[PDB]
Amino acid sequence: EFRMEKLNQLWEKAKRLHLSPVRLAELHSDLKIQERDELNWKKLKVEGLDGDGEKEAKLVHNLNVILARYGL
Amino acid sequence: XXNXX
Amino acid sequence: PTRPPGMCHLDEFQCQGDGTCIPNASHTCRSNEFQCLSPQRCIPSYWFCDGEADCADGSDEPDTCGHSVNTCRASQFQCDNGRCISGNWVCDGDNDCGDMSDEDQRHHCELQNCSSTQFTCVNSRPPNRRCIPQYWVCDGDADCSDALDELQNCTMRTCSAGEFSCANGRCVRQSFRCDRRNDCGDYSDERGCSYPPCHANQFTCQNGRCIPRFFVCDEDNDCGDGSDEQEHLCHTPEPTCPLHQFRCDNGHCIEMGRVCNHVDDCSDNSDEKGCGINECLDSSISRCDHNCTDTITSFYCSCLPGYKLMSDKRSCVDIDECKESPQLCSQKCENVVGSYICKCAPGYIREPDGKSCRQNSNIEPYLIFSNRYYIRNLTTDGSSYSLILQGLGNVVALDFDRVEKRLYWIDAEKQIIERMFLNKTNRETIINHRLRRAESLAVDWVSRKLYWLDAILDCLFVSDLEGRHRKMIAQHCVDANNTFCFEHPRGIVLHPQRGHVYWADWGVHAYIGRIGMDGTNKSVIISTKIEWPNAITIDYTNDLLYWADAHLGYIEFSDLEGHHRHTVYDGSLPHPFALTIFEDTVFWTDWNTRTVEKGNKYDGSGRVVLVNTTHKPFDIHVYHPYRQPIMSNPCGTNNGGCSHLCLIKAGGRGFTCACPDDFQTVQLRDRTLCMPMCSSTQFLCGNNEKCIPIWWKCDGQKDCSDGSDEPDLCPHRFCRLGQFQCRDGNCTSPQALCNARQDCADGSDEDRVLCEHHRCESNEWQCANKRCIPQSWQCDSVNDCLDNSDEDTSHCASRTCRPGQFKCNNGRCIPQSWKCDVDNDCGDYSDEPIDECTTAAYNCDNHTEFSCKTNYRCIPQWAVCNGFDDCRDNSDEQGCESVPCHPSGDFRCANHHCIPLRWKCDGTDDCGDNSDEENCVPRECSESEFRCADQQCIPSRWVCDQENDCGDNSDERDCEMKTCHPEHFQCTSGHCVPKALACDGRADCLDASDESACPTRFPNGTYCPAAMFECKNHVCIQSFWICDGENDCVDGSDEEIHLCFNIPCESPQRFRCDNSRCVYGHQLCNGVDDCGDGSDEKEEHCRKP
Ligand SMILES: *[C@@H]1O[C@H](CO)[C@@H](O[C@@H]2O[C@H](CO)[C@@H](O[C@@H]3O[C@H](CO[C@H]4O[C@H](CO)[C@@H](O)[C@H](O)[C@@H]4O)[C@@H](O)[C@H](O[C@H]4O[C@H](CO)[C@@H](O)[C@H](O)[C@@H]4O)[C@@H]3O)[C@H](O)[C@H]2NC(C)=O)[C@H](O)[C@H]1NC(C)=O
Ligand SMILES: *[C@@H]1O[C@H](CO)[C@@H](O[C@@H]2O[C@H](CO)[C@@H](O[C@@H]3O[C@H](CO[C@H]4O[C@H](CO)[C@@H](O)[C@H](O)[C@@H]4O)[C@@H](O)[C@H](O[C@H]4O[C@H](CO)[C@@H](O)[C@H](O)[C@@H]4O)[C@@H]3O)[C@H](O)[C@H]2NC(C)=O)[C@H](O)[C@H]1NC(C)=O
Ligand SMILES: *[C@@H]1O[C@H](CO)[C@@H](O[C@@H]2O[C@H](CO)[C@@H](O[C@@H]3O[C@H](CO[C@H]4O[C@H](CO)[C@@H](O)[C@H](O)[C@@H]4O)[C@@H](O)[C@H](O[C@H]4O[C@H](CO)[C@@H](O)[C@H](O)[C@@H]4O)[C@@H]3O)[C@H](O)[C@H]2NC(C)=O)[C@H](O)[C@H]1NC(C)=O
Ligand SMILES: *[C@@H]1O[C@H](CO)[C@@H](O)[C@H](O[C@@H]2O[C@H](CO)[C@@H](O[C@@H]3O[C@H](CO)[C@@H](O)[C@H](O)[C@@H]3O)[C@H](O)[C@H]2NC(C)=O)[C@H]1NC(C)=O
Ligand SMILES: *[C@@H]1O[C@H](CO)[C@@H](O[C@@H]2O[C@H](CO)[C@@H](O)[C@H](O[C@@H]3O[C@H](CO)[C@@H](O)[C@H](O)[C@@H]3O)[C@H]2NC(C)=O)[C@H](O)[C@H]1NC(C)=O
Ligand SMILES: *[C@@H]1O[C@H](CO)[C@@H](O[C@@H]2O[C@H](CO)[C@@H](O[C@@H]3O[C@H](CO)[C@@H](O)[C@H](O)[C@@H]3O)[C@H](O)[C@H]2NC(C)=O)[C@H](O)[C@H]1NC(C)=O
Ligand SMILES: *[C@@H]1O[C@H](CO)[C@@H](O[C@@H]2O[C@H](CO)[C@@H](O[C@@H]3O[C@H](CO)[C@@H](O)[C@H](O)[C@@H]3O)[C@H](O)[C@H]2NC(C)=O)[C@H](O)[C@H]1NC(C)=O
Ligand SMILES: *[C@@H]1O[C@H](CO)[C@@H](O)[C@H](O)[C@H]1NC(C)=O
Ligand SMILES: *[C@@H]1O[C@H](CO)[C@@H](O)[C@H](O)[C@H]1NC(C)=O
Ligand SMILES: *[C@H]1O[C@H](CO)[C@H](O)[C@H](O)[C@H]1NC(C)=O
Ligand SMILES: *[C@H]1O[C@H](CO)[C@H](O)[C@H](O)[C@H]1NC(C)=O
Ligand SMILES: *[C@H]1O[C@H](CO)[C@H](O)[C@H](O)[C@H]1NC(C)=O
Ligand SMILES: [Ca+2]
Ligand SMILES: [Ca+2]
Ligand SMILES: [Ca+2]
Ligand SMILES: [Ca+2]
Ligand SMILES: [Ca+2]
Ligand SMILES: [Ca+2]
Ligand SMILES: [Ca+2]
Ligand SMILES: [Ca+2]
Ligand SMILES: [Ca+2]
Ligand SMILES: [Ca+2]
Ligand SMILES: [Ca+2]
Ligand SMILES: [Ca+2]
Ligand SMILES: [Ca+2]
Ligand SMILES: [Ca+2]
Ligand SMILES: [Ca+2]
Ligand SMILES: [Ca+2]
Ligand SMILES: [Ca+2]
Ligand SMILES: [Ca+2]
Ligand SMILES: [Ca+2]
Ligand SMILES: [Ca+2]
Known part of the structure; x- marks a missing residue:
């Protein structure tokens, strides 16, 4: 479902917790969106296109809140 | 068994 | 002097014919970007010819793409054409190269570290993650197959009503057990699970997996054993077009009229790439040293006989007929280029056919x-x-x-x-x-x-x-x-x-x-x-x-x-x-x-x-x-x-010189010095011929070749041959020697001077005390050495299992085959790692073993239909009537179990329903067997041996009317006993006919050594058997009343009657007058003492 390494790990927990399927389905949706952003961020790391920390903070901010809305 | 002498 | 039979002298040659012997406007969009031909869109560099229309651009992929005209360099490490990466790309599992060739999970992998903000469960292979955030540690559920997550310094509770207790002291709901999944890390929920069988929509692997049909031949190993990707399961037979057709390159069959007709009927020109050029006649590409043949459209070489064709399809090689096909020539064969010669071994003549060798x-x-x-x-x-x-x-x-x-x-x-x-x-x-x-x-x-x-x-x-x-x-x-x-x-x-x-x-x-x-x-x-x-x-x-x-x-x-295993009988x-x-x-x-x-x-x-x-x-x-x-x-x-x-x-x-077992092969340059090194429980012959067991010393027969086995001054031999004699004359079995238990009445069997250098057998191991036990009993959680030296924790931690065996975690050593057999042979399940047993490296031998349905156990095929639960699944017994027994040697029971014919009418049930022993006619007793009244056959040596062997003394009749084998001694009653037991000092005939006519064994007239009471019928009994109430010798002298006056009474064992006889305790108040005076039945002893 996901190319992302650590997002695959997070995605397995929500299956184990049997969360709300609609919210569970939406959880896959934004994680699929985030993985594109996450790969884009670290694409810049090999391209050297960021040095201000924006492309890391913007993604971990949503992830940290996702830890609250999904117990992760 | 069947093979023991 | 002779010529050896049928052979010739070593200085002659033998003619093989007969055998006669003979003598030898881009809107400022150019910084790392290109145009999309639209007034608002701009192609970023490297994105043209990427394979996708990432921008609405007409120059993206108009077949202007060169795949590897310009390739990536080492500044961004390459993995595939047009795809190159570096950093943690090279081993993270992300799709970096478009095909995961950026890592292949092989190159530059197998080396990693994890940060302190996480916890590194390093005990997980790359298919299982080895680094999880600290928040995940004891969050409530585990993430590593190592599963130290929930057990890293975290507490527990007293389970739940609907949960299952795992072996690691943790509880989880019972819906996860027996589901073929590691729900608490150690597979504790999976021990002893009788898994359900797979359904029609599920393919069954070698191990019980019940995988659905989609992954079959999906080119990915999903069973773990590769059973879903077997080469013959995905077998693709070659389409040949046998009759008047032709096999195109793409796999089509077309009729013969559609070949060489100037029309591409095969869509790959396989029927027209030719038709007029004869490469065999090209005599330059044919290159066939042997003959050639140009078919409809192409050529091929063909070797003359005696030569084989190989990969190049042009050359030939001589066949090694004497190794590829030894069946041609009986006896010796000699290979030649393009042919072979048959030769008979010396002593055999070669018949004119060139293939038969006859003994001369x-x-x-x-x-x-x-x-x-x-x-x-x-x-x-x-x-x-x-x-x-x-x-x-x-x-x-x-x-x-x-x-x-x-x-x-x-x-x-x-x-x-x-x-x-x-x-x-x-x-x-x-x-x-x-x-x-x-x-x-x-x-x-x-x-x-x-x-x-x-x-x-x-x-x-x-x-x-x-x-x-x-x-x-x-x-x-x-x-x-x-x-x-x-x-x-x-x-x-x-x-x-x-x-x-x-x-x-x-x-x-x-x-x-x-x-x-x-x-x-x-x-x-x-x-x-x-x-x-x-x-x-x-x-x-x-x-x-x-x-x-x-x-x-x-x-x-x-x-x-x-090499070259040729089957004779298939x-x-x-x-x-x-x-x-x-x-x-x-x-x-x-x-x-x-x-x-x-x-x-x-x-x-x-x-x-x-x-x-x-x-x-x-x-x-x-x-x-x-x-x-x-x-x-x-x-x-x-x-x-x-x-x-x-x-x-x-x-x-x-x-090569060599020494016997109990010797040291001390090596010199000129000589191998065989220095005797026998144990203290052995006796060494004077000439160092051999070391014999110590109980053979002075036993009455010359065991040592030089005669040192029987010196003059050693005591009278009381025991039989093969028995150890204590220093006081009492007798014990050789196994009693240094067994750490006092067998001899004086402890003669356990002296330090005898057991200090005692050595055990090659199949046994010696304890701390010199007791010997079988090697399979070590570290088996049972005290077998009587001092627990076999179960010592340090010893079990340091010992090494015998070669070909496997060592458990608790120090137990078990046979290699017992590992990964769906059975807890080690007690602690150290021999059953599910992640390792469910691998292709532990498959069952297709040729000879049978695989159980719902698990990974392999059993030999001869265990099928046998009537036993060889698979713990019981899946080797289901519907077993389908298999046919052997056409000639197997008798089939009424319950469809095959048994060897030799067990039919053998006298014992071997089917279970007794169908083998039914409609049975007794067999013919052979030359040296004797037939009982009930038609049973017994060895003729068993007749008149004082044993009811047939079951009704049918073999014990009319003994005095016949003789017996010369090695026996015939008693007065006619029974036969071995000669060595006659004139030995003990009654072996039931009538004591032996020892009843033997001369004096001593000069002063005495027939027995002074230590033992001698009965008047010239037999010797041990003196503590006297007056015990048993007729230990048939003359009754060991029970005579008058000579029994010289005895005490042992109250905890025997009790004196009115007669001085002291009968054993159990006869007191037994209701039978045993002493003949009613004193044993004096009722005052049948009450509370
Ligand atoms: C069943 O079959 C066996 C084997 O064939 C026979 O055993 C042989 O019997 C013959 C005849 O007695 C023996 O031949 C004689 O042996 C004498 C000593 O041989 C020594 O060396 C041999 C070989 O190592 C040892 O086996 C043996 O123990 C001795 O150490 C020779 O000295 C004899 O030759 C001399 O005397 C004769 C006349 O008696 C002259 O004619 C000769 O010229 C010469 O002066 C003779 O060769 C032979 O040794 C036995 N072999 C074995 C293995 O024991 C059995 O006899 C046979 N049983 C029956 C009933 O037929
Ligand atoms: C192992 O093999 C031996 C021999 O085959 C068996 O029999 C032993 O043989 C000896 C020799 O006769 C016995 O010795 C005699 O025992 C009598 C009773 O013994 C008990 O009491 C004495 C003390 O009075 C203790 O020393 C002994 O340990 C017992 O507790 C004694 O009364 C006899 O003494 C009389 O004769 C001797 C000379 O022979 C005189 O010197 C004395 O003054 C006295 O007149 C005599 O000592 C022996 O008892 C037998 N048993 C044992 C246990 O050795 C064994 O039976 C056999 N092993 C077993 C246990 O079955
Ligand atoms: C008819 O003839 C037979 C055969 O000669 C006699 O049997 C012998 O009788 C003598 C005398 O009683 C026995 O000798 C005594 O044996 C005792 C026990 O034997 C142990 O020790 C001996 C010797 O080491 C071992 O061989 C044996 O295995 C036993 O372990 C000894 O304890 C006696 O020693 C005591 O007396 C002697 C003197 O006689 C002293 O020097 C010692 O210091 C000690 O005090 C003694 O050795 C002999 O064992 C008997 N042998 C047999 C084969 O039975 C009959 O006695 C004789 N009489 C009749 C009518 O039967
Ligand atoms: C192809 O297979 C044919 C048979 O179908 C072979 O004839 C041919 O090899 C040839 O074998 C023959 C017979 O052994 C040779 O003929 C010789 O003729 C001589 C008289 O003219 C006679 O004295 C010899 O003993 C032979 O019989 C012939 O030399 C040999 N080779 C050739 C080039 O024809 C096979 N062709 C090849 C080259 O594999
Ligand atoms: C296994 O069976 C064969 C056939 O029954 C035995 O062969 C014959 O056995 C007899 C009786 O034991 C021998 O006498 C025969 O050999 C003899 O050879 C001498 C010397 O030439 C003659 O003087 C005798 O007249 C006799 O022919 C023997 N015959 C042959 C041709 O082998 C064989 O011995 C037997 N083996 C055993 C172990 O008993
Ligand atoms: C001791 O045991 C070893 C192993 O059983 C023997 O080795 C084997 O010996 C045979 C016969 O020499 C070898 O066959 C030969 O192999 C060579 C190629 O290596 C080939 O050129 C010959 O024509 C022939 O086929 C076999 O390969 C060899 N195998 C190995 C792995 O050693 C050895 O010969 C034995 N030695 C003694 C003293 O008997
Ligand atoms: C016991 O016998 C087996 C089988 O004959 C031997 O196993 C073979 O050993 C080699 C070298 O270890 C193996 O190569 C390795 O294969 C693995 C898996 O593909 C790979 O990960 C390694 O990089 C390496 O290539 C080979 O596969 C294996 N099998 C055969 C048939 O060659 C083994 O050497 C013997 N002894 C031991 C020490 O077990
Ligand atoms: C497996 O069994 C087949 C026949 O079904 C046999 O032809 C093949 O040789 C066997 N393969 C092995 C590994 O023995
Ligand atoms: C062996 O036994 C079978 C069955 O009794 C019999 O038919 C056969 O003739 C026997 N073989 C010989 C050589 O007598
Ligand atoms: C155990 O085996 C090892 C090798 O695996 C050594 O041979 C060692 O000497 C063995 N121990 C014993 C008791 O012989
Ligand atoms: C006595 O019977 C035995 C039984 O094995 C032998 O047949 C022996 O030959 C017989 N003795 C006589 C003299 O017939
Ligand atoms: C007893 O047998 C011995 C030999 O063991 C002598 O033959 C002796 O003559 C016999 N008789 C007596 C009285 O000892
Ligand atoms: Ca593109
Ligand atoms: Ca990667
Ligand atoms: Ca956790
Ligand atoms: Ca489970
Ligand atoms: Ca598959
Ligand atoms: Ca055509
Ligand atoms: Ca050849
Ligand atoms: Ca001896
Ligand atoms: Ca003992
Ligand atoms: Ca064995
Ligand atoms: Ca033990
Ligand atoms: Ca096992
Ligand atoms: Ca086998
Ligand atoms: Ca079975
Ligand atoms: Ca068979
Ligand atoms: Ca039977
Ligand atoms: Ca009998
Ligand atoms: Ca006897
Ligand atoms: Ca008695
Ligand atoms: Ca009584």
Whole structure:
């Protein structure tokens, strides 16, 4: 479902917790969106296109809140 | 068994 | 001086014909961007010809793409054309290169670290993550297969009503158990799970996985065992278009009219890329040294006969006919370029056909073979059939010596090895010590040695032809992997020309091994497609190794190194046990039919049955001078100078001195000094010939060759032969010696001066105290040494399991086959790692083992239909009526179980429903058996032996009307007992007829030593048996009242009556007047004491 390494790990927990399927389905949706952003961020790391920390903070901010809305 | 002498 | 029979002198050549002997505007969009041809869109660099229309651009992919015209460089490490990465890309599992070739999870992987903000569960392989955030640690559920997550310094509770207790002290809901998943890390929820069978929509792997059908042949290993991607499951047969069609390159069939008609009917021009050019006539691409043939559109080469074609499709190679197809020429074959020559071995004449070799000797061969009680004399044509010997216990194997015409055999009942001249004289026993279980033996006619296999010790032995100088040659395992080891050694043959010893083993890992006659070069010859190799032999005129198999039912032969295995019988034999070769014929014995067969040795044609047998025939040899070929002894004279065994070197060129078992092979440059090193429980002969057990010392017969075994001043021998004598004269079994338990009344069996240097058997291990126990009992969680030295925790942590065995975590050592068999053999389940057992490395041998349905256990195919739960699934017994029994050797029970015919009417149930022992007519008793009244057959030695063997004393009638074997002594009542028991001082006849006429054993008239009361009928009994109420000697002198006055009464054991007799306690108040005076029945003793 996901190319992302650590997002695959997070995605397995929500299956184990049997969360709300609609919210569970939406959880896959934004994680699929985030993985594109996450790969884009670290694409810049090999391209050297960021040095201000924006492309890391913007993604971990949503992830940290996702830890609250999904117990992760 | 069947093979023991 | 003679010319050897049928041979020629060593200084002559033999003509093969007869045998006569003869003498020898981009809107500022150009920084790392290009145009999309639209006034608002801009292609970023490297994105054109990426494969996707990432921008609405007409220049993206108008077939202007060059895949590898310009390739990536090392600044961004390359993985595929147009795709290159670096950093943590190279091993993270992300799709970086478009095909995951950026890592292939192989290169630059297997080296990682994890940050402190996480916790690194390093015990997980890359398919399982090894780094999880600290928040995940004890969050409530685990994430690593290592599963230290929830157990890293975190508490627990007292479970729940609907949860299951895992072995790691944690509880989880019962819906996860028995689901084929590691729900608490240690598979504790998966132990002892009887998994449900798979359904129609689910493919079944080798291990129970119940995988759905989508992944079958999906080119990804999803079963773990590769069972879903088997090469023959995804088998794609080649479409050939056999008849008047043609096979296109793409796989189409078109009729013959659609070939070479100037129309591409195959859509790949396979029918038109030709039609007029003859490459065979090109005489430049044909390159065929042999003839060529140009078909409709192309050419091909074709070799002349005697030559083979290879990969290049142009060249030819000479066939090595004497190795590829040895069936062409009987006996020796010599390969030539493009042809072959057949040559008979010296002593055989070549018939004009060029393929038959006939023996030139005037001596006609015959078969000597052994039954339970009989060694028999059968000619090769079956015309004459006579008996050589009878009355033997169990002749499991035999062999003959050509040089001095002796016959050697193993009596498996008495566990002795005997020998005898072929005129039936000088029968004698050469080995009668140790020899726990010998199965097969072979006589070395060249170096004058004897070799045999022991099944319990699991050893290969060597000895002199008189039986002296026993040495243990091979042991443990035979390959470097320690996979094949001595389990059930059976069948042995020698090849003195090459100096090798061949033997087979029908253990779980069945094999055929080879070793040097000195033990140097042990190796594995055959290890594949073999289950029960009971038979082995060599054709000496061909250097071909012949062996049989009782399970797969075949007879097969190969070269001496094990290559080119050619099948003679394609699995149609019920149960061969032994076989032999002569000229062009195989002789072998079957157990299921109890017959001796005969057939051609190369194709099995002309199979005929030679004779029936009422008992199983075990060992068979063709007695002929040609079956033990003449060669010069490497140990010419004086045993090559060795004072002990002179053994042939591997390769048959040199020789090696060796010492017996209880000796040290101290090596010098000139001599191997055999320094005797026998244990303190053994006695060394004066001349250092051998060290015998100590209980043989002064036993009355000369065990030592020099006579030092019986010195003048040693005490009178009270015990029998083979019994240990305490210092006071009382007797104990040899196993009582140094067993850490006081057997002798004075402790004579446990003295430190006797047990200090005591040494145990090769199959036993010595405790802290000198008690010996079997090696399988160590670290078994039971105190077997009486001081728990076998179960010592430090000892179990430091010990190393025997080669070919597997060590558990708790120190227990178990056989290798017991690992990963869906059974807790270790007790702690250390032998059953589910992640490792469910792998292709532990598959079942397609040729011989059967795989259970719902788990990964493998069982041998002969366990199917047997009536037992071989698979814990019980899946080897379901619907087993489908299998057919063997057409000739198997009798089918009423419940569809097959059993060997030899068990039919054997007198015991072998089916379960007793259908084998029904409609049964009693068999014919053989030559040396005696028939009871109820039609049962018993050995004739059992008649008049004072035992009710038939069941109704039918064999005990009219004993005094007949004599018996000369080795027996006939009592007055007519019964027979062995002569050695007569005139020995104890009553062995029930009437005590022995010892009743023997002369005085001493001069002063006394018949017995002064320590023992002698009964008037001249028998000796031990003095504490007197007055005990039992007629220990038939004259009654040991119970006479007057001479019994000199005795006390032991109140806790015996009680005195009105008569001075002191009867045992249980007779008091028993209701029977035992003393004859009613004192035992005086009722005052039948109340509360
Ligand atoms: C069953 O078959 C066996 C084997 O064929 C026979 O045993 C042989 O019997 C013959 C005849 O008695 C023996 O031959 C004689 O042996 C004497 C001593 O031989 C020594 O060396 C041999 C070989 O190592 C040893 O086996 C043996 O123990 C001795 O150490 C020779 O001295 C004899 O030759 C001399 O005397 C004769 C006359 O008596 C002269 O004619 C000769 O020229 C010479 O002066 C003779 O060779 C032979 O040793 C026995 N072999 C074995 C292995 O024991 C059985 O006899 C046979 N049974 C029956 C009933 O037929
Ligand atoms: C092992 O083998 C022996 C011999 O085959 C068996 O029999 C023993 O033989 C000896 C020799 O006769 C016995 O010795 C005699 O025992 C009598 C009673 O013994 C008990 O009491 C004495 C003290 O009075 C203790 O020393 C002894 O340990 C017992 O507790 C004695 O009364 C006899 O003494 C009389 O004769 C001797 C000479 O022979 C004189 O010197 C004395 O003054 C006296 O007149 C005599 O000593 C012995 O008892 C037998 N048993 C034992 C246990 O050794 C054994 O039976 C056998 N092992 C077993 C246990 O079965
Ligand atoms: C008829 O003939 C027989 C055979 O000669 C006699 O039997 C012998 O009788 C003598 C005398 O009683 C016995 O000798 C005594 O044996 C005792 C026990 O034997 C142990 O020790 C001996 C010797 O080491 C061992 O061989 C044996 O295995 C036992 O371990 C000894 O304890 C006695 O020693 C005591 O007396 C002697 C003197 O006689 C002293 O020097 C010692 O210091 C000690 O005090 C003694 O040795 C002999 O054991 C008997 N042998 C047999 C084969 O039975 C009959 O006695 C004789 N009479 C009749 C009519 O039967
Ligand atoms: C192709 O197969 C044909 C048979 O179908 C072979 O004839 C040919 O090899 C040839 O074999 C023949 C017979 O052995 C040779 O003929 C010789 O003729 C001599 C008299 O003219 C006679 O004295 C010889 O003994 C031979 O019989 C011939 O030399 C040989 N080779 C050739 C080139 O024809 C096969 N062709 C090849 C080259 O593989
Ligand atoms: C296994 O069976 C065969 C056939 O029955 C036995 O062959 C014959 O056995 C008899 C009786 O033991 C021998 O006498 C025969 O050989 C003899 O050879 C001498 C010397 O030439 C003659 O003087 C005798 O007249 C006799 O021919 C023997 N015949 C042949 C051709 O082998 C064989 O011995 C037997 N083996 C055993 C171990 O008993
Ligand atoms: C016991 O016998 C086995 C089988 O004959 C031997 O195993 C073979 O050993 C080699 C070298 O270790 C193996 O190569 C390795 O294969 C693995 C898996 O593909 C791979 O990960 C390694 O990089 C390496 O290539 C080989 O596969 C294996 N099998 C055969 C048939 O060659 C083994 O050497 C013997 N002894 C031991 C020490 O077990
Ligand atoms: C001791 O045991 C080893 C292993 O059983 C023997 O090695 C095997 O010996 C045979 C015969 O020499 C070899 O066959 C030959 O192989 C070579 C190629 O290596 C080939 O050119 C020859 O034509 C022939 O086929 C076999 O390869 C060899 N195998 C190995 C792995 O060693 C050895 O010969 C034994 N030595 C003694 C003293 O008997
Ligand atoms: C062996 O036994 C079978 C069955 O009794 C019999 O038919 C056959 O003839 C026997 N073989 C010989 C050679 O007598
Ligand atoms: C497996 O069994 C097949 C026949 O079904 C046999 O042809 C093949 O040789 C066997 N493969 C192995 C590994 O023995
Ligand atoms: C245990 O085996 C090791 C090798 O695996 C050593 O041979 C060691 O000497 C063995 N221990 C014993 C008791 O012989
Ligand atoms: C007595 O019976 C035995 C039984 O094995 C032998 O047949 C022996 O030969 C017989 N003795 C006589 C003299 O007939
Ligand atoms: C007892 O037997 C011995 C031999 O053991 C002598 O023959 C002796 O003559 C016999 N008789 C007597 C009285 O001892
Ligand atoms: Ca593109
Ligand atoms: Ca990657
Ligand atoms: Ca956790
Ligand atoms: Ca589970
Ligand atoms: Ca698959
Ligand atoms: Ca065409
Ligand atoms: Ca050839
Ligand atoms: Ca064994
Ligand atoms: Ca096997
Ligand atoms: Ca079979
Ligand atoms: Ca002795
Ligand atoms: Ca003891
Ligand atoms: Ca134990
Ligand atoms: Ca197991
Ligand atoms: Ca079964
Ligand atoms: Ca039966
Ligand atoms: Ca009897
Ligand atoms: Ca007796
Ligand atoms: Ca008594
Ligand atoms: Ca009584």
